[model samples]
Target: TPVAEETRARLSKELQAAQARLGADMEDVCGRLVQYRGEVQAMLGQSTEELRVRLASHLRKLRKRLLRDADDLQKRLAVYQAG
Candidate 1:
């Protein structure tokens, strides 16, 4: 009981922090999204256009994964909290 109790305490603390970091990560991604949008807007030909398209795609995927990760932590927090 003691060990498991300590384990939950540790995990819950990290999960709370993990969720907090994801909030920052989301902001960073938003800043990059806008940053790249501006970059894409200024000066372009086919190569620059491709750069925008590809970078935009990757950032969208990254943001999506972060969202999923946050969701996973949220579920884990519930499980640990319940226990």
Candidate 2:
């Protein structure tokens, strides 16, 4: 078995990878948001209520996913700290 320091180093690497992945996911979402905004803006004659509901639903889904990932990351961090 590896020493505690070595194991800790491994854990740190894992954490870093996860953090980077999460960062990338967030950036992708931002890009999508900008695209969605542009698409919505172009629909000048569209029903405002429909657009508002769709946006709200999409935003809620994204928020839930983001929050869940954030919580999971926090738990991983706590485990790292404990280890």
Candidate 3:
């Protein structure tokens, strides 16, 4: 019982760390996306096709990264719950 409890405590700590990392990563990506949108909006009058393409590309990459992180976090949470 003691060993099981100890293992669970360790797992709980790890789960918290993983969750924090996931949250920070998500926040960073979201912030960049929002900032990029504002930058594009500010340059609306002078923004060219090239600029739009670049911004869109950046947003797409950020979205992909967010999705991957979310999936990873979900997996980690599931494992924690199982224990």
Candidate 4:
């Protein structure tokens, strides 16, 4: 049998590919918000602080989700590396 040594080498490319597709979807959510921040504030006539305050509030959810996923991945990766 072929052997592997890299981290997450056994995670299966299929799983990584699928997660990458889904990951991009959520990544785009915040990306689009930042991309449209100018138009968003201009249309609503809000100051930068006001816009960012609201923007950051909603973006927090996405940030938390990503961080949690990252935490879990790192935890698993550590184990993957050990085994």
Regions of model 2 farther than 4 Å from truth: 1-3
My TM-score estimates for the predictions, one after another, are 0.60, 0.72, 0.69, 0.52
Instruction: Point out the higher-scoring one by lDDT: 1 or 4.
Output: 1
Write the residue-wise lDDT of candidate 1 on 1-83 in tens digits.
Answer: 34377677767677887787788778878877787767766755335867677777989887887888788878877877566
Clashing pairs in 4: none
Question: Which lDDT value does model 4 have at 22?
Answer: 52
lDDT of 4 at 4: 55
> Which residue runs does candidate 4 get wrong by more than 4 Å?
1-10, 13-26, 41-50
What is candidate 3's lDDT per residue for 6-65, written digit by digit as tens? 788877777787778778877877787688768768876784677768777877887787
* Candidate achieving higher TM-score, 1 or 2: 2
- Residue 15 local lDDT, model 2: 79
- Compute the lDDT of residue 4 as modeled in candidate 3: 70
lDDT of 2: 0.76
- lDDT of model 4, residue 20: 70
| Model 1 weakest lDDT span, ten residues long | 40-49
lDDT of 1 at 45: 38
The candidates, ranked best first by TM-score, are: 2, 3, 1, 4
